[PDB]
Design an enzyme around this catalytic site. Structure first.
Site, PDB file in Angstrom:
ATOM      1  N   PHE A   1      -3.318   6.114 -16.341  1.00  0.00           N
ATOM      2  CA  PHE A   1      -4.562   6.174 -16.019  1.00  0.00           C
ATOM      3  C   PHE A   1      -5.551   5.572 -15.869  1.00  0.00           C
ATOM      4  O   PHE A   1      -5.883   5.004 -16.530  1.00  0.00           O
ATOM      5  CB  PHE A   1      -5.360   7.598 -17.169  1.00  0.00           C
ATOM      6  CG  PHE A   1      -5.096   9.048 -17.278  1.00  0.00           C
ATOM      7  CD1 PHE A   1      -4.835   9.719 -15.880  1.00  0.00           C
ATOM      8  CD2 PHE A   1      -3.643   9.155 -18.391  1.00  0.00           C
ATOM      9  CE1 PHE A   1      -4.867  11.462 -16.208  1.00  0.00           C
ATOM     10  CE2 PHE A   1      -3.349  10.845 -18.153  1.00  0.00           C
ATOM     11  CZ  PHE A   1      -3.486  11.453 -17.273  1.00  0.00           C
TER      12      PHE A   1
ATOM     13  N   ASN B   1      -0.240  -6.599 -10.464  1.00  0.00           N
ATOM     14  CA  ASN B   1       1.261  -7.215 -10.723  1.00  0.00           C
ATOM     15  C   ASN B   1       1.965  -7.741  -8.925  1.00  0.00           C
ATOM     16  O   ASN B   1       0.674  -6.403  -8.325  1.00  0.00           O
ATOM     17  CB  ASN B   1       2.054  -6.187 -11.251  1.00  0.00           C
ATOM     18  CG  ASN B   1       2.290  -6.382 -12.216  1.00  0.00           C
ATOM     19  OD1 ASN B   1       1.796  -6.892 -13.336  1.00  0.00           O
ATOM     20  ND2 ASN B   1       1.591  -4.746 -13.388  1.00  0.00           N
TER      21      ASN B   1
ATOM     22  N   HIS C   1       6.475  -4.673  -7.606  1.00  0.00           N
ATOM     23  CA  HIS C   1       6.794  -2.742  -8.373  1.00  0.00           C
ATOM     24  C   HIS C   1       8.033  -3.121  -7.204  1.00  0.00           C
ATOM     25  O   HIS C   1       8.497  -2.760  -5.785  1.00  0.00           O
ATOM     26  CB  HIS C   1       5.672  -1.805  -7.548  1.00  0.00           C
ATOM     27  CG  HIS C   1       5.871  -0.459  -8.322  1.00  0.00           C
ATOM     28  ND1 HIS C   1       7.472  -0.101  -8.204  1.00  0.00           N
ATOM     29  CD2 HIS C   1       5.235  -0.112  -8.941  1.00  0.00           C
ATOM     30  CE1 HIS C   1       7.221   1.285  -9.003  1.00  0.00           C
ATOM     31  NE2 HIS C   1       6.197   1.419  -9.169  1.00  0.00           N
TER      32      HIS C   1
ATOM     33  N   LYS D   1       2.098  -5.902  -2.578  1.00  0.00           N
ATOM     34  CA  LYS D   1       0.536  -4.903  -2.627  1.00  0.00           C
ATOM     35  C   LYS D   1      -0.038  -6.071  -1.442  1.00  0.00           C
ATOM     36  O   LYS D   1      -0.071  -7.646  -1.799  1.00  0.00           O
ATOM     37  CB  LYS D   1       0.032  -5.421  -4.480  1.00  0.00           C
ATOM     38  CG  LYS D   1       0.677  -5.014  -5.432  1.00  0.00           C
ATOM     39  CD  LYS D   1       2.167  -4.155  -5.645  1.00  0.00           C
ATOM     40  CE  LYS D   1       2.947  -4.046  -6.509  1.00  0.00           C
ATOM     41  NZ  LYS D   1       1.895  -3.810  -8.156  1.00  0.00           N
TER      42      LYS D   1
ATOM     43  N   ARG E   1       6.661 -12.653 -10.114  1.00  0.00           N
ATOM     44  CA  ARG E   1       5.564 -12.248 -10.663  1.00  0.00           C
ATOM     45  C   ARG E   1       4.510 -13.081 -11.109  1.00  0.00           C
ATOM     46  O   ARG E   1       3.267 -13.167 -10.726  1.00  0.00           O
ATOM     47  CB  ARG E   1       5.564 -10.736 -11.472  1.00  0.00           C
ATOM     48  CG  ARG E   1       6.771  -9.898 -11.697  1.00  0.00           C
ATOM     49  CD  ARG E   1       6.539  -8.423 -11.387  1.00  0.00           C
ATOM     50  NE  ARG E   1       5.890  -7.659 -11.771  1.00  0.00           N
ATOM     51  CZ  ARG E   1       6.091  -6.748 -11.567  1.00  0.00           C
ATOM     52  NH1 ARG E   1       6.654  -5.663 -10.886  1.00  0.00           N
ATOM     53  NH2 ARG E   1       4.929  -6.076 -12.608  1.00  0.00           N
TER      54      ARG E   1
END
Lengths: 201, 46, 51, 46, 241, 239
Positions: A62, A120, A123, A16, A110
């Site tokens: 969401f 996190n 992925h 990320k 992680r």
């Protein structure tokens, strides 16, 4: 799978924008653990891309923060592959929630790089079929799956390709145009059922 | 008009055969990888 | 496709007298040299490994 | 039937087209077919 | 360093700051070029320089057609008159182990640790101890067949920048997946990875043998090592790190 | 020439004797790296100099993937201040035919034969590239995708192939490129061996100041035009 053929297992693996700066250490641990990297690529997912990438689970997750943490800077996706790829990558990762991994798995990547539930560090594929879905999303035109030699290719063509191709070729037969490939290809581009009609005027 | 029975059945058979030939190619490649590399580890250690 | 792969082994190569080389041996040497860590761009290099 | 006209006109091209599309499984097979036919000219005619 | 590539990526440009003058450089170019004729070497290198005390030693190697140095070694106070240095052995290295101090510059000079140990033997023992091993080879620069034949990797492309930052992507030149890596070495941290001029050239500084600097151009088939130093090992490395 | 010609004085090593000072060389290294940043070129080779009567135009050329593309020219008077020179056409080639004389340092200079000195710079650089930009045989490999790439497995020319003009190519649109043996006049190219004959130096006689570098032992090559910037129309008299 019990063919003469022999088989490579493949898995997606992401970093990320708050961990991309430590791309190099993560790749070092990935290679040292025994994985082999097939292809790198630098991404920048707009929120539309984020909504489509998690589309198997975006209807339940969401989380606007989860869209921002893909959209707030670039990503580093990789295909990794080795003996039991997904389970070994899961073992390096640990629990999906980094808040649990921080205290319970010291060795986890992680825990080392992640921050919290939505921040996190990594992925990846949680399932082989999910592996094919995400890898076919992110890196188009890379063969990852067994080839549908038999009736599955016919079903694919009859469900996606044939309902357009039949009708287009039928009109090509009515017209009998010169150099017929222009008529077919431009017809397929113009009247794709899966896309809107574009009027460049 | 009725090309749905005429020509697409032939073409589906040809896609099946071309994918079969592709699989034959992939298989032959895989045997080549086995042959090269098994010749490598066996002879390299001797 | 077991008959087909049998025919595939049967061909490669009834030796081409024009050069005396075999597809099996030639491609085997080509791949053997490639598996000594040519890079990710090895797809663009086989044209002169063949040479 | 109109098979013979399109026997001569297309032949191997559609076969390779849907073979590649079935192998790849893109998100938009129809656009992939159109682009592939363009590329197929760009190799064959040129 | 390669005898033909001594101008390219100059020794002073490597950041160690000790190297050759233009006088020595031109003389060394033509002399190593003639050494390619006089001796049947597949390739000729400039191993490096030893400062000494009264006269500098200028060293050359040494490759046969094996493409892995056995090796022969040459020495010369100037860069003109190259003399064949006979190879070292276990007994010879055992005599030098009781000899300390900087090199003198006179090959005929004797020591008293007594065994009349010649400076010639001290030179070859120090050279082979440096070459057995702190000389460096990048990962993939060469390779070894199943038939015992070493080959220079003609398709070598340098190391990527990710692999540059790791000692795992470098090998000891001595014979040992084919050679031993530098991340198996003692003490840990004995190799100083560095980057000069951005990513133009890698510089590895040996901390066991001071003055040894290995140069590697990333993404390119330009590399090499040179020793410009004192000719004595920094055994005191553990107290530094 | 590439950045390897700016870490060492490869230009003056050719024996032509004209080149860059270490001041200009270091400045050019940093500035061409910044040009490769600002302009997303695959490579940024130093084209050379147009020695003017007031100041010299330091010229750089952008290289795409796709190296036979219409290469993008840049100029700088104070080396570092690089500016995108416009591309050349046929009209601007015909425009400067009425003008002769040495370049002026200010590119705003005007000739009454008006004509801007920038147009002269553009046209003369284009003419030099179409005429005497050198590529050694096999250094560039026409990719099957309709694009020219570096033949990154290129080994330098054998010393038997060094002496032939057929082993050198015009770096422009057209083994795909045209060879130098048809570059009339027949004696228009001078081939000489320096530095122990580990160095091939190939100088243009039609466009003086060009000197093409090549190391046969490796793939180190490049061309630089450091000169006055006119065409030697006197070449058949001089041969």
């Amino acid at each position: 799978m019990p063919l003469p053929q022999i088989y490579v297992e493949k898995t997606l693996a992401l970093i990320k924008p708050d961990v991309v700066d430590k791309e190099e250490e993560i790749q070092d641990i990935i290679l040292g653990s025994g994985f082999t990297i097939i292809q790198r690529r630098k991404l920048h997912l707009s929120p539309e891309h984020c909504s489509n990438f998690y589309v198997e689970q975006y209807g339940k997750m969401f989380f606007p923060n989860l869209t921002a943490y893909m959209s707030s800077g670039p990503l580093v996706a990789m295909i990794l592959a080795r003996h039991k790829a997904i389970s070994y990558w899961k073992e390096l990762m640990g629990p999906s929630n980094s808040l649990v991994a921080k205290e319970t798995h010291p060795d986890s990547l992680r825990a080392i790089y992640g921050t919290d539930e939505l921040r996190n560090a990594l992925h990846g594929s949680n399932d082989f079929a999910a592996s094919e879905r995400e890898i076919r999303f992110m890196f188009p035109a890379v063969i990852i799956e067994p080839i549908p030699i038999g009736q599955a290719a016919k079903d694919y063509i009859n469900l996606y390709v044939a309902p357009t191709l039949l009708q287009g070729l039928t009109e090509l037969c009515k017209e009998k145009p010169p150099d017929p490939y222009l008529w077919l290809a431009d017809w397929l581009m113009k009247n794709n059922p899966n896309k809107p009609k574009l009027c460049h005027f | 008009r009725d090309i749905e029975v005429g020509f697409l059945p032939w073409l589906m058979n040809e896609v099946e055969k071309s994918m079969e030939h592709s699989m034959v190619g992939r298989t032959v490649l895989d045997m080549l990888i086995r042959d090269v590399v098994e010749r490598r580890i066996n002879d390299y250690e001797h | 496709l077991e008959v087909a792969i049998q025919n595939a082994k049967a061909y490669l190569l009834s030796t081409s007298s024009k050069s005396g080389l075999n597809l099996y041996d030639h491609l085997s040497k080509v791949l053997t040299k490639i598996l000594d860590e040519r890079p990710a761009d090895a797809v663009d290099i086989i044209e002169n490994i063949s040479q | 039937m109109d098979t013979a006209y399109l026997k001569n006109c297309f032949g191997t091209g559609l076969t390779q087209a849907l073979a590649e599309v079935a192998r790849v499984r893109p998100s938009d097979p129809i656009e992939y077919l159109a682009h592939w036919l363009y590329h197929y000219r760009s190799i064959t005619v040129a | 360093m390669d005898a033909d590539s001594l101008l390219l990526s100059l020794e002073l440009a490597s950041g160690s700051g000790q190297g050759l003058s233009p006088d020595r450089r031109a003389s060394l170019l033509t002399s190593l070029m003639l050494v390619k004729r006089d001796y049947r070497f597949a390739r000729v290198l400039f191993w490096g320089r030893i400062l000494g005390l009264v006269a500098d030693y200028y060293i050359a190697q040494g490759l046969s057609e094996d493409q892995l140095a056995p090796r022969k070694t040459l020495y010369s106070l100037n860069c003109t008159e190259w003399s064949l240095l006979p190879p070292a052995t276990e007994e010879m290295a055992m005599q030098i182990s009781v000899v300390s101090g900087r090199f003198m510059g006179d090959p005929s000079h004797e020591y008293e640790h007594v065994v009349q140990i010649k400076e010639e033997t001290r030179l070859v023992s120090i050279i082979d101890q440096i070459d057995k091993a702190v000389a460096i080879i990048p990962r993939g620069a060469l390779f070894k067949t199943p038939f015992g034949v070493t080959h220079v990797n003609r398709t070598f492309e340098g190391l990527p920048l990710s692999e540059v930052r790791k000692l795992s992507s470098y090998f000891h030149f001595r014979e040992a997946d084919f050679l031993d890596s530098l991340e198996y070495d003692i003490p840990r941290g004995s190799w100083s990875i560095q980057m000069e001029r951005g990513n133009a050239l890698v510089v590895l500084r040996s901390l066991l043998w001071p003055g040894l600097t290995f140069y590697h151009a990333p993404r390119t088939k330009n590399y090499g090592y040179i020793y410009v130093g004192t000719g004595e090992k920094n055994m005191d490395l553990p107290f530094m790190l």
